[PDB]
């Protein structure tokens, strides 16, 4: 606990570190060479008599920690703060814990930044990312095409100035995000045309009757794609700005059109933020392991006024109660003479409201003049009333770049009043004694009992985008639609909840419920382990705290023999009913057996090796009959009642025992993720990339995710096979976890990825969102489901046509790009769904043609020379639409090549 400082003469910064009770200075240390070139250049040899030995209780009241390239749920942030109670720090240290890593930054005491210092239990740490997931909603109106002072279009100010500055700062601070850039706007009087009916909406006012037809358009630009070297989006946004007025005016319904309505009179603003929340509520569906923070930024040329319905504003207050992610910035400039974020109510004195949940920021342009006016002008030809907006004073608002380049995660400790009485008339206590066991079965019992993951309380998710017509503007998405119904419910009338979850030894967790804030109180696995894990799982969702030669590994060995199975596919006489000679003198030769050591397996062996042995010595494919005949004497598994195991092509993981535990109800918000195994052949994967140019059906395993010597945390997660055949088709592995730190599971996945590529074939994480509409349990509100028609021009049409469709698909197989029927796991199996081998492309088979979508989960890692380089995907689009709409004579020559057999 001793603290050692060591400057030299008049070093204006200092340095200090820890040890345990240094007095006589016999012992010194070298641990770091970097800190010399990180602070000051000198070579201190053993005792120059400058090393001060002092207790010096000097704290560092707020310290910032930045993350990169990973995924960290907030329980792991709690574990880092629990491990960072009583230590030292300095600027740009790389703090690590259990494969988790952060870089220290901007450490302050109350006015000033310190080079070094000490952290003890009462200073506060705040987590930020440079690897966040960020949406950019550009709101367009008729004020984009309007000039301002200094001489500009507001569009040109916004895009050119602000986006050039933001992308230069994104290059300078060396961050790597995942963006959307979505344009959105409204039009009026687009009533009806030929079958454009569920796209419109109709606005009205109660107190003075006013009802009009209107219509909302979203045009997306790049959807889910990280790349360095930006500013190409600036060129595409200029192209879409010039193409935009015809693109919005002359579409689906043509009455007299009024485009791009004013923001200070109407707007789809609050609906746009609510649809960003409709994206972010389903974060647990397809989980990237390379992003942490969440961010939604709306760029508007508005003044700050919005004329907004009452129900949507109250509903988005209740939805930003959960996960605060919203940021607003105004590229109009001209900071007005009142409290600038404000809402005039539009309910079905002009009723004002001011938000304190939003983070607004203006963008002044770069010039210097005399008196910047705060007013526009346009010449026509010819009981309470307790918030007004005008007596609130407001000097200037900046841009707040630090909350736009490094997004801040949600805090850990907040102070609030206790759970007394009156309104919240409901408490419930569950005291759950825990029996330690050495056989994964203890957390989930308490978990499904005491909460059922907000089984008590509701999720207030009342906005459902049920419809979306899309438009055949190009190969990004383009949904242009109506929001659909809003099924709002009020909060829990006359009672909130609070809970008392006890460990009957000595421990209590007191849960409050208006936002999930906790109070933990103290008085095989240990007691504190299960207690800490349960506090982490209450922490994950809403987590405020009150305060004051076989290497026989059970996946690697079977994965390696399924690698051996292609290259071996692609003794005396038989007919003796004694069977003792062959089936007992297998070990006389060099037959490899799992018999040296492994748990629950004295003398074991794999079926495929034995059947390849019996085809290497006896006849071809009648070996399973004699294998059953010897299985009637010598077995493999526990309670057999079977054939010769499975004779061929069937995966089994480890845990030999499964026959003679709480499951996962899908209400509990499982974090799941579908990795995928795709049989591949490089001989066409290279030239189309290059200059050339034209037994059940699921299986559960509950495995332990650790290759270390930890002895601190037991760590389990559930694999589901879809495959128990793996003929030469697709294969997929689902991972369901409500459990331990994701980064260890990420290095397990990447470990058998390295075992997949070297000596084998591709394992790729694959978006298990099929071609799903919005308001499905999978999917986004921003997916196109692109269409590609088969212009043919040449008893049971559909079945033979489906087989011919498989033939065209596997013809793209043979020449460039193999296919696989990715037989997914919904019962009755509605649509046929093909994955392409070694690429980024989904197809389904429903006009006459068949539809297409673009995988967004590769993201430049899990990357080899087989796949990659998105130009490949666009080339396959071009080649496939050429081959599909009957270019030169390709389909007709394919007809002749089929008919000549």
């Amino acid at each position: 606990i001793v603290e050692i400082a060591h400057p030299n003469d008049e070093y204006s910064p200092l340095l200090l570190q820890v040890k345990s009770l240094k007095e006589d200075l016999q012992k010194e240390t070298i641990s770091v060479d970097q800190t010399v070139t990180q602070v000051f250049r000198l070579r201190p040899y053993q005792d120059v008599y400058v090393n001060v030995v002092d207790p010096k209780d000097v704290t560092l009241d707020l310290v910032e920690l930045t993350f990169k390239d990973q995924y960290i749920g907030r329980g792991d942030m709690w574990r880092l703060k629990k491990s960072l109670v009583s230590t030292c720090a300095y600027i740009t240290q790389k703090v690590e814990f259990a494969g988790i890593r952060a870089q220290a930054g901007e450490l302050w005491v109350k006015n000033e930044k310190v080079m070094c210092g000490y952290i003890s239990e009462d200073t506060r740490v705040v987590f930020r990312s440079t690897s966040a997931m960020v949406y950019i909603f550009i709101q367009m109106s008729c004020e984009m095409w309007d000039f301002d002072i200094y001489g500009d279009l507001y569009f040109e100010k916004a895009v050119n100035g602000f986006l050039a500055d933001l992308f230069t700062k994104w290059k300078e601070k060396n961050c790597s995000h995942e963006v959307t850039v979505v344009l959105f706007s409204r039009t009026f009087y687009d009533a009806k045309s030929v079958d454009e009916f569920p796209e419109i909406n109709r606005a009205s006012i109660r107190q003075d009757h006013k009802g009009r037809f209107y219509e909302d358009f979203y045009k997306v630009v790049v959807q889910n794609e990280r790349r360095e070297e930006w500013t190409s989006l600036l060129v595409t946004i200029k192209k879409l700005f010039i193409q935009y007025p015809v693109l919005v005016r002359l579409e689906q319904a043509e009455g007299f059109p009024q485009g791009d309505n004013s923001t200070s009179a109407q707007g789809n603003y609050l609906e746009a933020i609510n649809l960003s929340f409709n994206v972010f509520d389903k974060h647990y569906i397809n989980r990237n392991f390379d992003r942490t923070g969440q961010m939604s930024v709306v760029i508007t040329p508005g003044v700050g006024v919005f004329e907004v319905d009452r129900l949507l504003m109250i509903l988005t207050k209740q939805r930003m109660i959960d996960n605060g992610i919203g940021v607003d910035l105004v590229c109009m400039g001209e900071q007005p003479l009142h409290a600038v974020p404000l809402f005039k109510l539009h309910n079905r004195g002009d009723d004002y409201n001011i938000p304190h949940w939003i983070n607004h920021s203006f963008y002044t342009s770069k010039s210097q003049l005399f008196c910047n006016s705060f007013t526009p002008r346009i010449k026509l030809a010819g009981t309470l009333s307790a918030p007004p907006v005008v007596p609130g004073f407001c000097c200037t608002v900046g841009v707040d770049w630090k909350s736009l380049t490094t997004p801040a995660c949600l805090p850990l400790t907040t102070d609030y009043f206790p759970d007394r009485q009156g309104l919240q008339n409901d408490y419930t206590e569950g005291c759950y004694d825990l029996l330690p066991e050495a056989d994964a079965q203890q957390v989930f019992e308490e978990f499904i009992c005491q909460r059922l993951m907000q089984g008590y309380q509701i999720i207030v998710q009342p906005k459902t985008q049920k419809p979306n017509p899309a438009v055949p503007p190009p190969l990004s998405s383009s949904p242009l639609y109506s929001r659909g119904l809003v099924s709002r419910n009020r909060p829990e009338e006359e009672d909130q909840y609070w809970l008392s979850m006890g460990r009957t030894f000595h421990k209590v967790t007191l849960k409050d419920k208006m936002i999930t804030v906790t109070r933990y109180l103290p008085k095989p696995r240990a007691d504190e382990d299960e207690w800490q894990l349960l506090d982490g799982f209450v922490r994950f969702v809403e987590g405020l705290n009150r305060i004051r030669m076989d290497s026989p590994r059970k996946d690697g060995a079977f994965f390696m023999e399924f690698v051996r199975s292609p290259r071996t596919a692609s003794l005396t006489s038989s007919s003796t009913l004694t069977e003792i000679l062959e089936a007992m003198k297998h070990p006389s030769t060099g037959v490899q057996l799992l018999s040296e050591q492994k748990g629950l397996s004295p003398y074991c062996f794999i079926s495929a090796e034995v059947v390849h042995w019996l085809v290497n010595h006896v006849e071809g494919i009648q070996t399973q009959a004699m294998a059953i005949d010897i299985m009637q004497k010598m077995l493999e598994e526990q309670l057999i009642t079977h054939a010769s195991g499975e004779a061929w092509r069937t995966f089994i993981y480890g845990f030999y025992f499964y026959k003679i535990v709480d499951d996962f109800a899908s209400f509990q918000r499982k974090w799941f993720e579908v990795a995928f195994v795709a049989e591949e052949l490089v001989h066409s994967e290279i030239p189309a990339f290059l200059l050339p140019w034209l037994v059940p059906e699921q299986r559960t395993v509950t495995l332990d995710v650790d290759v270390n010597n930890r002895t601190d945390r037991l760590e389990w997660c559930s694999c589901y096979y879809h495959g128990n055949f793996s003929l030469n088709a697709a294969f997929e592995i689902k991972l369901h976890w409500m459990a331990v730190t994701a980064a260890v599971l990420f290095e397990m996945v990447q470990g058998w990825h390295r075992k997949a590529t070297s000596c084998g074939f591709l394992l790729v994480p694959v978006l298990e969102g099929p071609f799903a509409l919005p308001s499905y349990l999978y999917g986004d509100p921003l997916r196109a489901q692109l269409f590609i028609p088969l212009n043919i021009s040449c008893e049971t049409y559909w079945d033979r046509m489906h087989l011919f469709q498989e033939a065209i698909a596997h013809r793209f197989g043979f020449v460039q790009d193999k296919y696989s029927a990715s037989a997914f796991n919904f019962p009755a199996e509605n649509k046929p769904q093909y994955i392409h081998v070694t690429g980024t492309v989904f197809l389904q088979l429903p006009r006459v043609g068949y539809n297409w979508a673009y995988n967004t989960m590769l993201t430049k890692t899990w990357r080899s020379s087989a796949t990659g380089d998105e130009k490949f995907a666009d080339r396959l689009l071009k080649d496939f639409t050429d081959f599909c709409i009957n270019r030169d004579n390709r389909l007709v020559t394919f007809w002749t090549s089929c008919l000549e057999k």
Binding site: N425, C431, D433, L435, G455
Partner: protein
């Protein structure tokens, strides 16, 4: 103490409204009859483990009572819920009117526990008799006795009466525990030896953390049934009062005109009280006989 850590299973079911989870919450969380007004609605299933004098641990299931939850019990996952059941408790409201649906659920529950438990047992418990006059309390309890003895025909049931504002609750769950206990005869023999060689009026031994009447021996049979209930209620009221003082009890002494009662720790989770048939003795007898008792029970 030989720690044969078994794991017993007990369900608590019945109709919603009156006193489903309230009685469990006042018998295993140190509440009062007034503060149980704040529990409110439960959900489908919630359960708990409670440890109890060491070795025995109860999986205590509390089942809800809405229409969809009982239907999702019977015509659904039933085989998981009614498997390996030892003790069933079935709650009866007095004031409730829909008796037909109550006995309909009761018939279906009896047939389901018959087809999923051969040697379990059912205790039905008519609670909340604090609203009816005492002569009508006698009439209603005897009618429930006879009617439930008829409708519980192929397998027997035990029907008790209770309320929350009295001590018959403590008697009824004392009966549940004394049926559910593993061992009887060795503790009875040590009880009888202790009481007949240290000549007491009556000796009483209890669990510590909830104080249910485990065992007793007397030689003055002039208190009818309500001595155990009353003394358990009043000293657990005193323990609830001392709970707000950050202090444990573990020891007390009282003597009177013809009366000499003493309470102390015996073992890791057991209380003893005793009245000793000789009121004019100071604590030397209590000293030598807590010595005389802890030489034997700490060989047990």
């Amino acid at each position: 103490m030989p720690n044969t850590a078994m794991k017993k299973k007990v369900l608590l079911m019945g109709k919603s409204g009156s006193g489903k989870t309230s009685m469990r919450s006042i018998i295993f969380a140190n509440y009062i009859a007034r503060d149980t007004r704040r529990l409110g609605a439960t959900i489908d299933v919630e359960h708990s483990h409670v440890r109890f004098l060491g070795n025995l641990v109860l999986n205590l299931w509390d089942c809800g009572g809405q229409d969809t939850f009982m239907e999702n019990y019977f015509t659904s996952q039933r085989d998981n819920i009614f498997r390996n059941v030892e003790v069933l408790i079935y709650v009866f409201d007095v004031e409730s009117r829909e008796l037909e649906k109550d006995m309909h659920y009761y018939q279906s529950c009896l047939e389901a526990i018959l087809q999923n438990s051969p040697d379990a047992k059912i205790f039905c418990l008519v609670h909340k008799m604090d609203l009816v006059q005492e002569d009508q309390r006698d009439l209603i309890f005897k009618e429930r006795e006879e009617d439930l003895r008829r409708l519980s025909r192929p397998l027997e049931c035990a029907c008790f009466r209770t309320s929350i504002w009295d001590e018959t609750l403590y008697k009824a769950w004392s009966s549940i525990v004394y049926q559910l206990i593993p061992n009887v005869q060795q503790l009875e023999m040590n009880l009888r030896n202790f009481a007949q060689i240290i000549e007491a009026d009556e000796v009483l031994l209890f669990e510590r953390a909830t104080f249910l009447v485990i065992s007793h021996y007397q030689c003055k049979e002039q208190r009818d049934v309500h001595r155990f209930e009353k003394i358990s209620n009043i000293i657990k009221q005193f323990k609830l009062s001392c709970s707000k003082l950050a202090a444990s009890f573990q020891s007390m002494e009282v003597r009177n005109s013809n009366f000499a009662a003493f309470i102390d720790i015996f073992t890791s989770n057991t209380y003893v009280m005793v009245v000793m048939s000789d009121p004019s003795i100071p604590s030397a007898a209590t000293l030598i006989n807590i010595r005389n008792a802890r030489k034997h029970f700490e060989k047990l």
